Each structure stands twice: as structure tokens, then as C-alpha cells.
Point group: C4
Chain length 291, copies 4
């Protein structure tokens, strides 16, 4: 469908993953109206992350924020691949960070990243599969969204993002109905405890899993987790998604798992990524007390 300032279309991998593209006109207006604040301004003054979010959404006739929220909160969807026409080269890395910042802070707030010391982190790669997982499993607070952007890509064969929506996982009911699915387990990167599975508000399964940080306490937990790992990694429901330079995935971390495919080692390989993770925060008609 045609919205104000962007277009929206289902991906070739899955109707659950929608591709959102900001038009050139919208992109150049946004970059002009946020040229005043460099990325370092966003790092130091967090309210500016919300200011550039507003500018972007205002440029979309206030259609962007409700569309982002409806898509990410919809159990049937929950995943976007987002880009802006004309932003597609590593030389525009700062513009990429500004744009991703604006989109994220229309739907929530991005958390501190211990690896960068900022609300986002940039990584350079210069090659086996990264297994599917949820982020944020080793802290008490829930991470609702994962944002992963391709900043640069050179002589890169393979390395697609891997995605699995829990409602596409043919082994969901077998593992979810197991008693250990509800057992709180230790997670360590202070340790926290929570089960591998939980439920959303409607009783449907969500996951809080990563194989590196879950710490099975005994043989019973361990053997079950290793079968869970196999059952996830071999699932026929996994999506394999190219993420070209200037595109980013924005996914609901509760019922999507993500990872990364193997890629070819090449001497001149360069891949740059940018990540953000945070929680949802948005207005809705709902109950409160007092005045």
C-alpha cells in the first residue's frame, strides 16, 4: 500500500516480514532537518533521539509511528526491513545511525550498550553460523526489539540474517508443552533467573533463549537444552534474509529469534554492522488510577 512518505511491501522470504522504504523526497528532507545535530549530539543528549524521531514521523504526515507500532506488536508480523532511498553507502554511516535512531525512538527507547558505551554499537568484521536467539536474556528487564543495520559490505558471500518466527517453528508445541519450558533457569553473561519460554498476554508462547548464556544446572536441564538447540537450528521455518547496506531489520524480540548465516572467509572481506536494542513505549487507551 501507499502511505505518506514511504512505501510498504511484503518481503520475498515471508509475509510476516514487511519492507518499509522511505522515499527520496522524505529522506532528503529528514537529513536536512536533522543536519543540525551530529550523531555525537544524539550520544550525549538522549532527548535528541526523540526529537529526530518526531521530525521523521512529522515528515510522514504522522503515519509512520502508528504503522511501526501496529506492525511490531502484531503477532502475525512483528518484523520490518527498513531503508531510505539514497542512503546506501558506508560513507553515509552517520545518516544511517540518525535514521535508525529516529525509527526506534518512535516506538520505544534504545538501551545502553556495554560494548560501545552508547545507545548503539558499531562492529566491523574483517564465519560459521551464529545460532538463533533472543537478545537481552541475561538481565531482568525485557528487551522488546532488536535493530540490526548493515553499514558496510565488501567481498561478502553469504552471511544473511537468519530469522525464526515462533509460529513458523514446527517444534514449538513439543518444547513449549514440556515441563522444563516453565522452569526458571540461570542466565549469565549479577545472574538472573527466568524460563526459556514464557507467554504473551493472550497465552501464546514467547522465548527468552540463547545457548551461550543459559546455564543448565544439571544433566536434566542440559540434555533438554541441547535438544532444544538442535530443534531450533534445524527448523524448516527459518528465514534467510539479505540485508543490503543501508537496510535494517527491526524485529519483535519476544516471538522472533535471530542469528546470522555462515559466510565465506575472504582476505578483503569487510562488513560493518550497527545494533540497537530497547523496550517498547507508546500511548494507548488503557486504565489508570487516581488523578
Amino acid at each position: 500500500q501507499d502511505y505518506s512518505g514511504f512505501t510498504l511491501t511484503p518481503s520475498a522470504q515471508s509475509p510476516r516480514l514487511l519492507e518499509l522504504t522511505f522515499t527520496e523526497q522524505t529522506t532528503k528532507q529528514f537529513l536536512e532537518q536533522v543536519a543540525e545535530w551530529p550523531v555525537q549530539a544524539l550520544e550525549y543528549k538522549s532527548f535528541l533521539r526523540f526529537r529526530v524521531a518526531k521530525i521523521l514521523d512529522d515528515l510522514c504526515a504522522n503515519q509512520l509511528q502508528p504503522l511501526l507500532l501496529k506492525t511490531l506488536l502484531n503477532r502475525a508480523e512483528g518484523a520490518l526491513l527498513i531503508n531510505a532511498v539514497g542512503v546506501d553507502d558506508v560513507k553515509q554511516a552517520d545518516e544511517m545511525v540518525k535514521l535508525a535512531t529516529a525509527v526506534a525512538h518512535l516506538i520505544g527507547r534504545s538501551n545502553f550498550d556495554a560494548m560501545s558505551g552508547q545507545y548503539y554499537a558499531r562492529f566491523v568484521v574483517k564465519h560459521r553460523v551464529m545460532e538463533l536467539h533472543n537478545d537481552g536474556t541475561y538481565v531482568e528487564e525485557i528487551t522488546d526489539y532488536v535493530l540490526m543495520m548493515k553499514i558496510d559490505e565488501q567481498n561478502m558471500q553469504g552471511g544473511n540474517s537468519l530469522l525464526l518466527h515462533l509460529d513458523d517453528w514446527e517444534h514449538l508445541d513439543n518444547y513449549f508443552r514440556h515441563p522444563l519450558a516453565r522452569r526458571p533457569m540461570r542466565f549469565a553473561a549479577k545472574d538472573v533467573f527466568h524460563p526459556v519460554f514464557d507467554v504473551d498476554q493472550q497465552g501464546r508462547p514467547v522465548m527468552r533463549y540463547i545457548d551461550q548464556f543459559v546455564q543448565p544446572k544439571d544433566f536434566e536441564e542440559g540434555v533438554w537444552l541441547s535438544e532444544l538447540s538442535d530443534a531450533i537450528e534445524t527448523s524448516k521455518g527459518i528465514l534467510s534474509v539479505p540485508v543490503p547496506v543501508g537496510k535494517f531489520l527491526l524485529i519483535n524480540n519476544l516471538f522472533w529469534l535471530h542469528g546470522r548465516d555462515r559466510f565465506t572467509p575472504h582476505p578483503d572481506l569487510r562488513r560493518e554492522l550497527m545494533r540497537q536494542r530497547g523496550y517498547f513505549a507508546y500511548a494507548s487507551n488503557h486504565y489508570q488510577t487516581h488523578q
Copy 2:
């Protein structure tokens, strides 16, 4: 008016800001009577900060402490620019620190400075505006006073101290009456929570704001804070105050915000500053219990 040991006169920028000058006679007597304790003695033995405060006030026929307290506690004023005749060169930096220490510890105590590891900090600059703010917003305890002294100044164009008394801010009522004015927000440099506005004992607005450390949790808090920032930074009530070498500002941190103007980058630029921050502590007739 003519006091004992010093003179007091309103500034050219504002009747709220008073200029206090210690006479040459008072200055040389003070420096003589405190020559026994170098600044390093004040760093190691905090009661000596109060000893040099007493010496200074005794040299003013005990008129200084009550004048300092009455001015800083007066909502109509709350700000002093203080100097001593004959102390005006970077070579007298230690004397400057002694004098500022004596003045501060007549009205309170200066807190530990994480940047220096001492009760004061000296910074050298060798250029855009520093936005108006209150100090101490990222800890639980209230900072009542900010003390900022010019130790050295070379080839410096611009860079005045910026000051804003809340009762000169034409947008006070619009932001203070907003519901978010009373919302406790997260501040981070352990995180603390408090609103951007509060009230003094008489119900009049005070502020605990800085754009770098306030952490809006969502789009609602963020957009409001960015408009607050604009409304402060563009206020026609801001004072632009030169602070010559050997002068220091001493302001009530609750209803004055402070910052620093842009200055010209110059290859041979040198500016040295000294800061102290602390809480008020003083005698008054008021109620207690027991014996």
C-alpha cells in the same frame, strides 16, 4: 553600601547579581593569616577549610557570613560575583583557591569532585555554547551552590558565563504548569529519579535540569524535554557575564541555571577555571526536639 572589609554593588547585567570586592587591606591580611596552610593542607584536612573561612569572616568584623547567606538565600538575588583587590593573576592560583574556599565554607561545605579527587577541581582549556543547567542532578543529595572561578585567561574572545534566574524566564509558567514538570525522570552520569522541576519552601519553582544527564524514557518525555531545552536556550532573560581572572561566581543552584557562551578558537588560547559545588549549612533560629 559600605561594609566592613569589602564593598558590595549591583552588577551591570542584573540587580539579582551582586559584586562583592574584598579591599586590598582585607586581602593582604587574609593571605598573611592563612600563609601557614598551603592548598595541599586544605585538601588533606577538611576542617582547615572552615578555619580559613573563619579568619576571612573575622577580618570582616563578622559581617561577611551573614551577608553571604542573606544574598544567596534571597529568592530575589541568589548570585554573587566575588573578587579581592590585588588577586588577579594566574600566578596567584593558590591564593585564589584559598579565598574561594574561605568564602564557600562560611555558607556550607564543598563536595568531593570526582574529576579531581578533591573538594575542588581545576580545568585548563586550550567552543560552542554550554547549555544552561543545574549541577548535581545525577545524585540524590541536593547541590545548593555552584562556585566557578576564572584562574587564567589568555587570548580569550567570548566565553562569558551564562546565567538564568528562573524568575527572569518568560516560559517558566508554561513548562512548570505542565504535568511532565512533576514527573520523576531518570538521571544518569547508580541512577537517580526526580522531576525536572520542584518547589522551594514557599511553593515557588526550582529546577534540577541538565540535558546531558536527563534520560527521557519514551517519546512523550523526550519531545517535551527538547521543547524545554529550546525554551531555556532561547530565553530573553539570560545574563551574559564576563568573569575576569580572580573573580568567581557563587550562585544558588536551585533557581539559577548556568552555562557558558561560545568563544573564538585561537591557537594561543588558554583558559583556566576552578569549580566547587556544595550544600548550604548555617545557623538559624528554628525548632528541634529533645535535649
Copy 3:
């Protein structure tokens, strides 16, 4: 006796210490079936420690785990010296770690080692007695088992493992019946407090002692601890056990103490060790509440 996949035989030092040897056939099958996961995979993904435990026990017709548990939990025994035919050279260090990992995680879980940052630690030596002690005395949680493996041994004269089963200690009753045996004392490597002696479920003495970390608070505690030390170190019940390359001791840390004999300083001496410590965890028929 002849079990499935291994043999079991009493040691020459003591009927309490049993020697368990995996057959060549079992050893090569295990190494083949776990070749897919290098040691670094076990370091990062703890459930894999339980996966390789299962593979080993499945290769023993599920006779290994119950035998390990029955031996280690038996007060009359509680100690194993374990090896696999064909794994006996430092070049197979990784295979050694895999095998020891599999055995340990059939009976419990190995704890984080602050010296290595992993669930195990490797040390190289390149010479006086290490006194008998229990591990884990400076934390609140009980360490049930100590696993010590010889990875390499070159020009090594002496240095046997020293072992003492409390039921072989001729001074047990004299020290256990002393009031200070039940006095909680301070242990420090946050400090913890516990007595030097405790009891198992049947009222029989267990120990939580090491001379370096126990911190007697006064002359009374100190003199008694020094006599305890002498009484342990001179006990005629101590076993002196060679541990050849590829063998490991696996002992119940509650009623066995361990240490190390003096060895000859030699310029070309090389000794490599690997340790794991953890808690028991296993299935048994016992009571629970609720459903």
C-alpha cells in the same frame, strides 16, 4: 568387575579409591561422536558439557552415571581414578578435557574458575608439600567434588597426589569432639563463616578446612587450628597416589581431603594439570510438594 564400556578395579593404595578405565573401543567412539564440538564450544555453551556427558554414558549402556554416583556418594569409597585407554599424551589435552567434562557432568556441574574464567582451569608447573585440604571453603555454597587431571609430566620425580579419607584419620574423634570443631570461623580468599567440621546426613563428620583461608580470630582458635594442622599432616592414613598423564582423580570433597607431595626441582621439569570443582546433581526417588 566387568561393566559395559569400562573396567573397575581397586587401587593399590586403598580399597576406598577405585580405578575406572574406559576401553579403547569406548574411547575412540566417544572421541568420534564429540569431534564436532571443540573445547572452546564447551567453554561458551554450557549445555554441551551435558551433551558430551550423555554421549559417553550412552556408549556405556547407561551403566556409567549410576556407577559414578554410587561410588562418589558411598561413604566407604568416594574416590575414583579415571582414565581412557589410548589417551595418555599431552598432545591429547583437548580430548582429556572433553573426557573429564563428560564424566563430571554425569554427576553434577562444574563451577566457574576465577583463575581461568572458565568451567575448568589448566596450570603449568616449571615443590614442598601442599597441605591436605578441602576445596571451596571460602564461598557459601558447598563444593561436592574435586576433579584433578594430569595433562603433562616431564622429568618429574615425586609430586604424588595426597589423599586422606576422614574415616582413615586416627585423630578424627579427638578433633571432632572438641568444642571448636563446631565453632563457625571466618574464611577469606566477601568473607564467609562456617565451622571446620560438619556432619553428613547420618551424623558422620565431614570437613571444610584449608589452612590458608581459615582466619582464626584469637589465640584460642589459632592454637587449636595449628594442632589440627599437625594432626592432619602427620596422619598415618594419608594415601600417596601417582597420577599418570591422562588419569584424573574424582573425589567427594566432603570426607576426602587432598594435597600434593613434594617433588624434585629439575631444570627441565614440566607438569601440567587441569582442575574442575562442582556440586552433585542427580535424580533420586524422594519427596516433593505440590504439582
Copy 4:
């Protein structure tokens, strides 16, 4: 008087300070019987500190411990200068540490020293007065004793230990009867709070004072502390005590303050000191409950 293994005699500075000298026969027997444990053994295994204490006291026909306790606990005395005939050269530093360790652990236990990471600390000096103070004022637990030993002394003019018994301080009653004497104040090297004065079991004044770590909160506390400082530093009751190599002071930290006199800067100056601090612990007939 003549005791078994040592002699005891009042000092030339004060009848409150007694000089205890171990005879040559006692000294050589002690060093022989503790030759088995080097100082590094005492650092690692704290009960050995009590073992060498016992050996020393046994060599004194068990007269040493009761004499040490009676002297240090006696309000009229509370201070010893201790030496052993034949131990008087820096080359015997380890022997000095052994001897001081044995004496201290007959009457208590020496605490961890953050400056050395051991139960004692050695410092080399290679020159103004160190003001009188009590140790341990910045932690919650009471330090009952300070032990200070001269390990080496070369081209040293001046630098006597300074001592003040509170019952020799002509200003005791004036400061003790002041309300601020009972005011808990902040001490910082987590901060602790306690008054400058307290009382012993009989209501007599004790002190917990040092000018560097006490943190007066305001002008009232500060001015009073500075007068207290003057009143202590100018007291005519201060003792000036040479401490030759191999001698150590052992004082009751509650009613003795200590410091150090000025000394002459000399290019070839070398002074080595060893300190221990701890709490009293000893047997006495007194009440308990239960069995």
C-alpha cells in the same frame, strides 16, 4: 621487676610507658623454635601467627601474655616499648616481624593492611610533624592496638614517636564536656559515622580522632575541630620517644594518641618501619548464656 624470660622497666619519658626486653637466652630460643616458618608462612597461614605467639609465651613460663594484657588494658599505663636482646639490625628484619607477630597475637589479632595486602606493612622513608591521632577511625570496627617497629635507621636526626595519654592532656575536660564531643561525625579515607570522643566501660574518655579523615559537615563542626587540633598538638603532656632499630611501640589505641616528630632531611637518610593494628582478644571470667 624480674619476670621469667624478660625484664620490665619504666621509661624515661613516662611511668605509663613500660619497656619490656626479652633476654638473649629467650630471644635465641624463640628464633630457633620458629626458624621452621618464614615470614611468608605467617602471611599465608594466619594460625601460624598464633603458633609463634604460643612458643614465645611458653618460653616465658607463660608469664608474658598475662603481663601484656594487664599492662595494655590498664588505664594508668596502656603502652609498651618492646625489644629482644640481640635483634637490632635491619638484616634481622624477618626476625623482627616474627617477634612482633608473636607479641601481638598473644593479646589479639592483627588486621589486614590495605597498603601491604598483609597482616602487617613495611614502609621505607628516604619530614614535618605527623599530628597525633588514633588509628582505624574510618571503619566501623574498633582498633584496640597500634604496633610500630623501627626496622632500619640511617643518618636520622629527630623523628621520635610522639605519644599522648588522654589522662596527661590538660585540655581533656574542656573538649570532652563540649556538646560536639558526642556528635557523630563523618569519617572518610564506605563512610562511617562516630563521635570524636567516646567512653570506656568506666565512663572515662577515649578518642577516635584523626584530622585527615574527620569530615566536619559545616562551620560549627569545622571551627571546633580546628581548635581541638591546636589543643592536642600544643599539649604539654606529649611524650617524645626514641624508637631504636629492633624496638617497637605497642599501645592501647583508645586512650593513647600517636604521631611522629619532624626530622632532618638528609640525602643519605633511610628509615624503615613496620606497623600492625588489631583488636584485643583474650580469656576472662565473665558471663555467657546457654550451654
